[PDB]
Write a protein that binds this ligand. Structure first.
Ligand code: ADP
Ligand code: MMC
Ligand code: MG
Length: 254
């Protein structure tokens, strides 16, 4: 079992505010890693540093040991690191298939980036074969021509994961993919995550808390004030963590 991603004492300031105070995490290939913590604890910031949206002021980030510290999304895409993005409104006017194909212009970048650089949605062989192979995986093949806006919220979320898959990634990073969903949808999204894990794909996900999808998590990290305050590897440890007095205290009123 090998480590696929590690961060070493990542520090990030926003003015005089230290958002990340020396965060060192480790993700192993295939692990569904979840980072939780109260709002403002620095989870999105950590992920933004790891995925090229923010530079680390101090610290190193390694993907397969290759120092990827501070590389933009366009470069990280070549390394096999992708991020899921929320679907912009205009993409909801495009078909499910177009939603998967538009990522070939600005690969690994925000959909707005791709949507604004698009002359005509690419329709090449290997591309369409990839898209349809992904639609089969998500069991959304018959929806290929349906406008993204007419999909259920949950089907739209699967399509967002589908876009990330277009880039044939090694690691998919998701910032709060199941925020606000009902238990059934949370299970649905996470069932597909498990299926993707079986194919060797690694997941680094952020969620506010952990409950419904508890048994889907291989590795857990709890953040607070830009620092890692707890960690669990495995069902029992993860359950210990969630019941940790100090962990529930940071959740008073949240
Ligand atoms: N781009 C930014 N510029 C200035 N402050 C930021 C920026 N991004 C995040 N912050 C601050 O960092 C802290 C939280 O980090 P964030 O990643 O958003 O937390 P979380 O994802 O855990 O809710 C907050 O105090 C937030 O206001
Ligand atoms: C990178 Hg267009
Ligand atoms: Mg956040």
């Amino acid at each position: 079992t090998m480590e696929i991603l590690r961060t070493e004492n990542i520090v990030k300031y926003f003015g005089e505010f230290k958002a990340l105070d020396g965060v060192s995490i480790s993700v192993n290939k295939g692990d569904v890693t979840l980072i939780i913590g109260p709002n403002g604890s620095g989870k999105s910031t950590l992920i933004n540093v790891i995925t090229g949206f923010l530079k680390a002021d101090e610290g190193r980030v390694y993907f397969e040991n290759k120092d990827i510290t501070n590389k933009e999304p366009a470069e990280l895409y070549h390394y096999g690191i992708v991020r899921t993005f929320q679907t912009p409104q205009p993409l909801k006017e495009m078909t499910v298939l177009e939603n998967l194909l538009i990522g070939e212009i600005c690969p690994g970048e925000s959909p707005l980036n791709s949507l604004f650089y698009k002359k005509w949605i690419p329709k090449e062989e290997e591309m369409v074969e990839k898209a349809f192979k992904i639609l089969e995986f998500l069991k959304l093949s018959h929806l290929y021509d349906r406008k993204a806006g007419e999909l259920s919220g949950g089907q739209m979320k699967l399509v967002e994961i589908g876009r990330a898959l277009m880039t044939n990634p090694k690691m998919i990073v998701m910032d709060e993919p199941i925020a606000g969903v009902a238990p059934g949808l949370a299970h649905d999204i996470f069932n597909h995550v498990l299926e993707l894990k079986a194919k060797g794909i690694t997941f680094l996900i952020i969620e506010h808390r952990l409950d419904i999808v508890l048994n889907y998590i291989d590795h857990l990290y709890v953040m607070f004030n830009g620092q890692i305050i707890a960690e669990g590897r495995g069902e029992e440890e993860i359950k210990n963590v969630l019941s940790d007095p100090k962990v529930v205290e940071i959740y008073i009123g949240e």
